Swiss-Prot record:
Cell cycle recorded as keyword: no
Protein name (Swiss-Prot/TrEMBL): Lysine-specific demethylase 4D
Sites bearing PolyADP-ribosyl glutamic acid, chain numbering: E16, E17
Cited function: Histone demethylase that specifically demethylates 'Lys-9' of histone H3, thereby playing a central role in histone code. Does not demethylate histone H3 'Lys-4', H3 'Lys-27', H3 'Lys-36' nor H4 'Lys-20'. Demethylates both di- and trimethylated H3 'Lys-9' residue, while it has no activity on monomethylated residues. Demethylation of Lys residue generates formaldehyde and succinate.
This protein's encoding gene: KDM4D
Organism: Homo sapiens
UniProt modification remark: Ubiquitinated via 'Lys-63'-linked ubiquitin chains. Deubiquitinated by USP14 with the help of TRIM14 leading to stabilization.
EC number: 1.14.11.66
GO molecular function: chromatin DNA binding; damaged DNA binding; histone demethylase activity; histone H3K9 demethylase activity; histone H3K9me2/H3K9me3 demethylase activity; metal ion binding
Predominant subcellular localization, coarse grouping: nucleus
Binding residue positions for Zn(2+): C228, H234, C300, C302
Keyword Lipoprotein belongs to the record: no
Domain JmjN: 8-50
């Protein structure tokens, strides 16, 4: 069995190997990459996502989210308070202000220590989940707006034709902005490209051990667990590496830098934080190997997780018993 310790693998495709996205994903899995839950892909040196970022300040962040924490430094939840709209130029200036900017630090490790010590005492503002793309239309390789759609994958594998669309999302981050522990909707893959700015640190639990993280989360967030049988779908809970290590939960960590892709694999729980002002683009995708994960994915029916239009069909076709109850949650 390849990668039996479930280490995060790093790939360096050549420009030739960068042509066929599906084939490269399947290659990485042949090497055991999925066992980690997360892989890094460094593009060939010849590739570029677009020519310059010199003209992005006019993108609007219609609903910036202030991420307010509750709990203790290593075990906390965050709620998202909606803020007034601002442009990316306005948000970048805010990120760089004395109140929000990255503190002085020695290296990524020192910064990680400072994040876990101090995150809860601040409320950074995240421009998350903005429909759009920063890939040039002329970028033909690994262009996250030109991927094969999940609807088409389901049609190709299973013969069924369904409504829905699959588009990318932009994320504008600042120091301490946080993504809580989650898997993707319907335990899909994700791919994330860091277009510019400061790094993003990721934590990940191997898919084969995801249920160990779930059991810990039920113990650490006991009221949330009674409220919902899949409350990590709410995307609000944080657990630090120190707490994971104290509880024996297998995990890995890695830092993504500008110019690099990350892939998350079906049922790979992940969480993380941004080092400073940055912009990422991400989208969900599927392969044939996902279908069985999609059939088994948990679902939030308490009503909190409230998701996209396109998830309806995935539930309807892959999980027809749950359909009914899950849709009561969404309506
Ligand atoms: O970048 C972020 O804030 C969160 N991204 C993801 O969870 C992802 O790409 O799957
Ligand atoms: Mg602009
Ligand atoms: Ni994710
Ligand atoms: Zn729920």
């Amino acid at each position: 069995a390849q990668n039996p310790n479930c280490n995060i693998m790093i790939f360096h495709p050549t420009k030739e190997e960068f042509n066929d996205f599906d084939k490269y994903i399947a290659y990485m899995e042949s090497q055991g990459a999925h066992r980690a839950g997360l892989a890094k892909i460094i593009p060939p040196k010849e590739w570029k996502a677009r020519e310059t970022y010199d003209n992005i300040s006019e993108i609007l962040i219609a609903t910036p989210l202030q991420q307010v924490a509750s709990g203790r430094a290593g075990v906390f939840t965050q709620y998202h308070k909606k803020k007034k709209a601002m442009t990316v130029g306005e948000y970048r200036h805010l990120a760089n202000s004395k109140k929000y900017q990255t503190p002085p630090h020695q290296n990524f490790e020192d910064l990680e220590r400072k994040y876990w010590k101090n995150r809860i005492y601040n409320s950074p503002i995240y421009g998350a989940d903005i429909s759009g793309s920063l890939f040039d239309e002329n970028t033909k390789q690994w262009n996250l707006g030109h991927l094969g759609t999940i609807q088409d994958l389901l049609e190709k594998e299973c013969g069924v034709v369904i409504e829905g669309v699959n588009t990318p999302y932009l994320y504008f981050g600042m120091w301490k902005t946080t993504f809580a522990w989650h898997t993707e909707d319907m335990d899909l893959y994700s791919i994330n490209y860091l277009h510019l700015g400061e790094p993003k640190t990721w934590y990940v639990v191997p898919p084969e051990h995801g249920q160990r993280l779930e059991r810990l989360a039920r113990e650490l967030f006991p009221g949330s667990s009674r409220g919902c049988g899949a409350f990590l779908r709410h995307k609000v809970a944080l657990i630090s590496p120190t707490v994971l290590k104290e509880n024996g939960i297998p995990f890995n960590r890695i830092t993504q830098e500008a110019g690099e892709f990350m892939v998350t694999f079906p049922y790979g729980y992940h969480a993380g934080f941004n080092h400073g002002f940055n912009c990422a683009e991400a989208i969900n995708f599927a392969t044939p190997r996902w279908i069985d994960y999609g059939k088994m994915a948990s679902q939030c029916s308490c009503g909190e997780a409230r998701v996209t239009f396109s998830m309806d069909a995935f539930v309807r076709i892959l999980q027809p018993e749950r359909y009914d109850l899950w849709k009561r949650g969404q309506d």
